[PDB]
Amino acid sequence: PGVVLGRDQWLFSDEEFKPTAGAEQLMQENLALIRGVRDTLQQHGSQLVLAIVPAKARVYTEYLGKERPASLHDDLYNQFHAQARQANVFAPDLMAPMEQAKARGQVFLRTDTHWTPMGAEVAAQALAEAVSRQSLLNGDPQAFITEAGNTAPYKGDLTNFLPDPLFSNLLPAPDNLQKRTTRPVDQIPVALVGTSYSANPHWNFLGALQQALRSDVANYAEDGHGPLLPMLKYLQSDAFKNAAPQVVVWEFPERYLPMKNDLSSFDPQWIAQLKNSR
């Protein structure tokens, strides 16, 4: 796990660049698992809304440096969407609105892998439009208010992969980060599953979803295990088994599709069920 230098003191995850051995079969395998998850949710009466997060390197190509991503990454976002469609998985396009939103300010942090709070809010709004368009939610709307607090420097997660403290003067300038918190005006109908994009309060993706959906949302995202393991954990949970939500939003950044997931802790019989759900 490493970092790639861009222009103007931008940093990227090399996971958005590196080739992966056996990437084709890994993508196949992950898609079969995603499809099995979709079918499992549907069988419990939950609608899956897959949220494919585009790579920072795809959204900010203008800050690419000398190194460019390998060919695997050229059309990964598009192929993920195409395969999700083949699998009858509902996956609203997040790339077009995030790209539109670059004119307003940064939709990703310069020195960090993650979307900015504004970037996450754009994604939440796109997802909420799609949810409304498909009538996936019923129930009385609940109103939420998001308040913007102070802005302060933020050291990005990628800076720690840089080479050594004798060279601290070479580190890129910290990002700036605006605090944003969401509160209600005053069984949960929506569950959120995903990665640090969803688990980390700094990006306020949960709050942005609550506000955009006009619905309470429960967070089952986790930091540091990729997008699949927290979803499998959720499916095995008492929360899901005893109170399946109307909608599950599954945040799944594109770079994880051709990456291996450690399934060693799961029953192979259950893994088999997921892959063979059709």
Numbering used by the authors: 79 to 241, 243 to 265, 279 to 370
Paste lines from the article.
The O-acetylation of alginate requires the concerted action of four proteins: the putative MBOAT protein, AlgI; a protein of unknown function, AlgF; and two annotated O-acetyltransferases AlgJ and AlgX. AlgI is predicted to be a member of the MBOAT family, while AlgJ and AlgX are required in the O-acetylation of alginate as the polymer passages through the periplasm. The TMHMM server v2.0 indicates that AlgJ from P. aeruginosa PAO1 possesses a transmembrane helix from residues 12–29 that tethers the periplasmic domain to the cytoplasmic membrane; a prediction that is supported by in vivo localization studies. AlgJ exhibits acetylesterase activity that is mediated through the Ser-His-Asp catalytic triad similar to that of the SGNH hydrolase-like enzyme AlgX.
To this end, we have determined the structure of Pseudomonas putida AlgJ75–370 (PpAlgJ75–370) to 1.83 Å resolution and have functionally characterized the protein. Selenomethionine-incorporated (SeMet) protein was expressed, purified, crystallized, and the structure determined to 1.83 Å using the single-wavelength anomalous dispersion (SAD) technique. PpAlgJ75–370 crystallized in space group C2 with two molecules in the asymmetric unit. The dimer observed in the crystal structure is therefore not believed to be biologically relevant. SGNH hydrolases have an α/β/α fold with each of the four conserved active site residues responsible for catalysis residing in one of four conserved blocks. The structure of PpAlgJ75–370 reveals that the protein has an α/β/α fold with a core of four parallel β-strands and an isolated β-bridge at β3, which are comparable to the five parallel β-strands found in canonical SGNH hydrolases. A surface representation of PpAlgJ75–370 reveals a shallow groove that crosses the face of the protein (left, centre). In PpAlgJ the corresponding residues D190 and H192 are located in the shallow electronegative groove (centre). The active site of PpAlgJ75–370 and the orientation of the putative catalytic triad D190, H192 and S288, is analogous to PaAlgX27–474 and other serine esterases and proteases. Examination of the PpAlgJ75–370 structure suggests that Y348 is in a position to act as a hydrogen bond donor in place of the conserved asparagine. AlgJ appears to be a circularly permuted member of SGNH hydrolases as the order of conserved residues in primary sequence (H-S-G-Y) is different than that of SGNH hydrolases (S-G-N-H).
